[PDB]
Amino acid sequence: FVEMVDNLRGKSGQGYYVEMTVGSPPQTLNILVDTGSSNFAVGAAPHPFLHRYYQRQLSSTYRDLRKGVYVPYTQGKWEGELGTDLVSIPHGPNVTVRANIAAITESDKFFINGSNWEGILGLAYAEIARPDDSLEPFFDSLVKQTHVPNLFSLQLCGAASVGGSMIIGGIDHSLYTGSLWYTPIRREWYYEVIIVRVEINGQDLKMDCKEYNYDKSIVDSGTTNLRLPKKVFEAAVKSIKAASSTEKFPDGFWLGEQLVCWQAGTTPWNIFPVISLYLMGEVTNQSFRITILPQQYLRPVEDVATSQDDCYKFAISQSSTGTVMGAVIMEGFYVVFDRARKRIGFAVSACHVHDEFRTAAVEGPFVTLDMEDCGYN
């Protein structure tokens, strides 16, 4: 696993990518690591933002599945032609596998101008694979065809240019301190989990925990933000707003309509609360909490063309897809996707950005009653 440590790169806000090779001879692409989706889809046409792209005509081991896929978002979309070919991961295990590939032939708001990736690796489960669960995701293909164990772990750092590690098939104990705690994967579609309690600085939100997982809580390397549903966002904001009242800021900033700024060497960390999410634990009435800092939900806007100060976006934001534990959360922690045991483990990350006062923590056990009532149906 030394071989896999530090095999992820990226740029702030533009996600984390791993090098992969597709086809024979191998074509190298940088692929986005995305636990919020289940499709393996690379650019197959010379879109002008793309550094590289898949040239099926150059690969002897390509096979057309003679079907299409249309995949919309808001209001991004991509569209492609299904096939299969031999995929490999240079800084992953030493294997080559035949996985499904969507040759992306048309997209909107999908590719990022500036980014250095050309495709997406959906690592979540078949139930949400487009066009349907017949299309076996890459990781299912990898485990099904090799002795690679049914688990992967992610250490997302971010110091600009970000870095991380995706350990395919195991856990690198150097990447985290203290102990892993595990929350059950509630269903194998997205990596769904159940938040049972939310505190800000310590004081909980006393809010029907069901609203925390309405209609989903997921773990999503594809998203930058911590995204909370409507009311929860409201409630958290108000409490973060209160907690933080040493100063005042515009209403827009909280809604991610504005940025807020201080000068170099002049941000007040402490004037901001910590956030704790308690997650359903492995045993009945047993939970554990993950605690982030504001260095995780105030992320600098790398380069703001009309400003030479220190600004930051409020990286907590609202939703109707559900809760979304994105970069904000995952950068605090080493996150083990133990697919083999339907569970996600969290440990304080050896590379997260702490100061000398506070630190990100994973702690337990706590006693939380009625944890199954927080899930929605």
Q: Interface residues with ligand 8AP (CB under 6 A)?
A: 15, 32, 34, 36-37, 73, 110, 120, 220, 222-223
CB 249 within 8 A of CB 261: no
Q: Which region holds residue 126: left if phi is over 0, alpha if psi is between -120 and 50, else beta?
A: alpha
Catalytic residue among 172, 220, 251, 370: 220
Between 220 and 338, name the residue whose CB sits nearer to ligand 8AP.
Answer: 220
H-helix or E-strand spanning residue 138:
helix 138-145
- Whole-Å CA distances, 100 to 23, 89, 261: 11, 15, 45
Between 222 and 294, name the residue whose CB sits nearer to ligand 8AP.
Answer: 222
Between 82 and 123, name the residue whose CB sits nearer to ligand 8AP.
Answer: 123
The neighbour count for residue 346, using CB atoms within 10 Å, is 28
Between 68 and 202, name the residue whose CB sits nearer to ligand 8AP.
Answer: 68
Using DSSP's 3-state secondary structure scheme, residue 149 falls into coil
**DSSP bridge pairs for 87:** 22, 97
Shortest approach of ligand 8AP to residue 78 CB, angstroms?
A: 8
Between 5 and 112, name the residue whose CB sits nearer to ligand 8AP.
Answer: 112
Distance CA(206)–CA(212), nearest Å, equals 11
Between 125 and 181, name the residue whose CB sits nearer to ligand 8AP.
Answer: 125
Shortest approach of ligand 8AP to residue 369 CB, angstroms?
A: 32
Shortest approach of ligand 8AP to residue 267 CB, angstroms?
A: 28
Using DSSP's 3-state secondary structure scheme, residue 105 falls into strand
Shortest approach of ligand 8AP to residue 120 CB, angstroms?
A: 6
Distance CA(125)–CA(107), nearest Å, equals 23
Distance CA(140)–CA(276), nearest Å, equals 33
338 is catalytic: no
Secondary structure (H, E, C), 228-262 = EEHHHHHHHHHHHHHHCCCCCCCHHHHCCCCCEEE
- Ramachandran angles phi, psi of 205, nearest 5°: -100, 0
34 is catalytic: yes
CA angle 229, 192, 103 (to 5 degrees): 100
Among residues 58, 44, 131, 138, the alpha carbon closest in space to that of 95 is found at 138
How far does the chain reach from its first CA to its final CA, in angstroms? 40
H-helix or E-strand spanning residue 280:
strand 275-280
Between 222 and 375, name the residue whose CB sits nearer to ligand 8AP.
Answer: 222
- Ramachandran angles phi, psi of 139, nearest 5°: -65, -35
Shortest approach of ligand 8AP to residue 40 CB, angstroms?
A: 12
Catalytic residue among 34, 85, 140, 338: 34
Shortest approach of ligand 8AP to residue 231 CB, angstroms?
A: 21
Shortest approach of ligand 8AP to residue 340 CB, angstroms?
A: 22
- Which residues belong to the active site? 34, 220
